[PDB]
Design a protein around this ligand. Structure first.
Ligand SMILES: Nc1ncnc2c1ncn2[C@@H]1O[C@H](COP(=O)(O)OP(=O)(O)OP(O)(O)=S)[C@@H](O)[C@H]1O
Ligand SMILES: [Mg+2]
Lengths: 212, 41, 54, 53
């Protein structure tokens, strides 16, 4: 806090984490992780990173193998009162009169369930909902379906990924299956002076804009 | 909510995104119009 | 053919390979094969005087 | 459990070590051995008329 406030301009290089092997097992002969938790400050890049992962997968730039059904699921949009069933939650992010579910969900080993803004529902998790559905062809009640998905009842071997502001942590830790979480920081020192060169048109603009 | 674990259990220890941000919020407290926090003088 | 034994073994080996301590902030699990020693097991023959002296 | 899964003990003898925690299993509602085997068996339906055979 204090130093970054001052300048935090000193040379402090670190070892970076990559993105294609975010789900690979820690060692080399263990078991692959089945949950990741991105956490960062408010408006630091969670949703843009989720979109980047989705678009890169679609283009075929990462996770070519592993899984092929990264179902983006925004938390704010998904209201939890009515009847949300995993069938509908897969249809919504799947343009078709009917997407093949008895075939898509027949290999939960190959799936990703990218989520976002789990801070949108902190308040929503307070009493442990006794009913935890384990089927995708049922009226799963919405919030109960979400809790079951988080706890890995629905497609228990279907990988996951949750982005969230650091506002729950504790209450969330009673629902995660030992997830490997990653904290996000932002643009470090040169990523900024490279971001200006992507926002502004040319060098004539970018140089003065950055210097200012 | 950055939570720090000491000894056997971890505690909440809420914090601001940054010290300059907290200073800006203090300035906004002074500017804006209305246990007791520091006299608005 | 579907060696459901194989699939169940894979699932259990995946789900039972990390040990979260009491004070474990998110994503701080530790592998069992790393932090697992071997205890002492005995077929109990513990008498009363033996228990008190122990 | 993990050693069995990796194949380091009880290779023969049995192959369905169903971990069952006692605290989690509340005893009022309807617990049936089918559900108690499903819970520790990730699938829409695990073959029970074959596992318990
Ligand atoms: N990878 C990126 N590179 C450059 N700019 C970015 C990037 N990601 C996000 N931004 C900028 O940051 C803004 C919001 O980023 P987000 O991470 O989506 O914020 P957010 O965290 O979704 O907001 P919250 O916290 O979920 S309410 C975008 O409008 C972009 O302009
Ligand atoms: Mg976000």
């Amino acid at each position: 806090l204090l130093a970054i406030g001052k300048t935090k301009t000193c040379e402090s290089p670190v070892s970076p984490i990559k993105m294609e092997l975010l789900f690979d097992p820690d060692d080399e002969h263990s078991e692959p992780v089945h949950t990741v938790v991105f956490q960062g400050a408010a408006g630091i890049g969670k949703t843009i990173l989720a979109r980047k992962m989705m678009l890169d997968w679609a283009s075929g730039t990462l996770y070519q193998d592993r899984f092929d059904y990264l179902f983006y699921i925004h938390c704010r949009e998904v209201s939890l009162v009515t009847q949300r069933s995993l069938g509908d939650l897969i249809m919504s992010c799947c343009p078709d009169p009917n997407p093949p579910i008895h075939k898509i969900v027949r290999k939960p080993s190959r799936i990703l369930f990218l989520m976002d803004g789990f801070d949108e529902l902190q308040g929503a998790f307070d009493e442990h909902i006794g009913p935890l559905c384990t089927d995708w062809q049922k009226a799963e009640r919405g919030d109960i379906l979400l809790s079951s998905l988080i706890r890995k009842k629905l497609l228990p071997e279907a990988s996951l990924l949750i982005t969230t502001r650091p506002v729950a942590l504790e209450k969330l830790q009673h629902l995660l299956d030992h997830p490997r979480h990653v904290e996000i920081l932002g643009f470090s020192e040169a990523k900024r002076k490279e971001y200006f060169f992507k926002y502004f048109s040319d060098e004539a603009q970018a140089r003065a804009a950055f210097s200012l | 909510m950055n939570l720090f674990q000491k000894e056997v259990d971890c505690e909440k220890f809420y914090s601001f995104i940054h010290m300059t941000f907290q200073e800006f919020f203090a300035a906004m407290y002074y500017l804006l119009e209305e246990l007791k926090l520091p006299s608005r003088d | 053919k579907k060696d459901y034994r194989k699939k169940y073994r894979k699932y259990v080996r995946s789900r039972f390979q990390c040990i979260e301590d009491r004070n474990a902030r998110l994503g701080e699990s530790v592998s069992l094969n790393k932090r697992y020693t071997r205890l002492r097991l005995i077929k109990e023959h513990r008498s009363q005087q033996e228990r008190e002296q122990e």
